[PDB]
Amino acid sequence: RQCSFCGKDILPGTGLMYVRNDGSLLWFCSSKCRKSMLKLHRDPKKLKWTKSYL
């Protein structure tokens, strides 16, 4: 499955699933992606280490 910030593949047995009060799910490959959505709120379209840059 795929990271919700950077879009890359999450190998089994690693990562984190985050559950929000509306029932939606978020997948994170590392803490760097978890912090970049839940804490820093940076957007991924401006970073070219992200699959969403283009």
Partner: protein
């Protein structure tokens, strides 16, 4: 009750005097954990609890007829990450409980928000009124 026979034990998320939200329409909104059913510990340690545990709570915020009263509740969501036996880590947005009657049936007729499966397997009456189970 029904799924404790597996490895029912996770990260120690909650304690005495920890605050939780009441995820049902019983009337309460916020509570404070007063006792943990079943724990027996060591010198200086505060008893702990995680998902699918029975607790005693005291309602701090809610309707006048339930405020400042003691009830039984089970933990359904927790902020601190915990790992399922298939190796996946789960994490919720807040710590929550649902208030039950002495025989195990929910006091409210509706449950707000998602519920962990370990809470739905151990407490079948709660799973009957829960809409979404994670």
């Amino acid at each position: 009750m029904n799924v404790l026979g597996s490895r029912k034990g996770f990260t120690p998320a909650l304690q005495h005097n920890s605050s939780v939200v009441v995820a049902d329409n019983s009337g309460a909104k916020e509570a404070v954990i007063i006792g943990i059913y079943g724990y027996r510990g060591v010198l200086r340690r505060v008893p702990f609890a995680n998902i699918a545990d029975l607790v005693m709570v005291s309602v701090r915020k809610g309707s006048p007829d339930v405020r400042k009263q003691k009830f039984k509740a089970v933990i359904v969501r927790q902020r601190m990450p915990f790992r399922r036996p298939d190796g996946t880590w789960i994490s919720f947005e807040d710590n929550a409980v649902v208030i039950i009657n002495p025989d195990g049936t929910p006091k409210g007729t509706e449950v707000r928000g998602p519920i962990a499966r370990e809470a739905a397997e151990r407490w079948p009456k709660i799973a009957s009124v829960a809409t979404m189970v994670i």
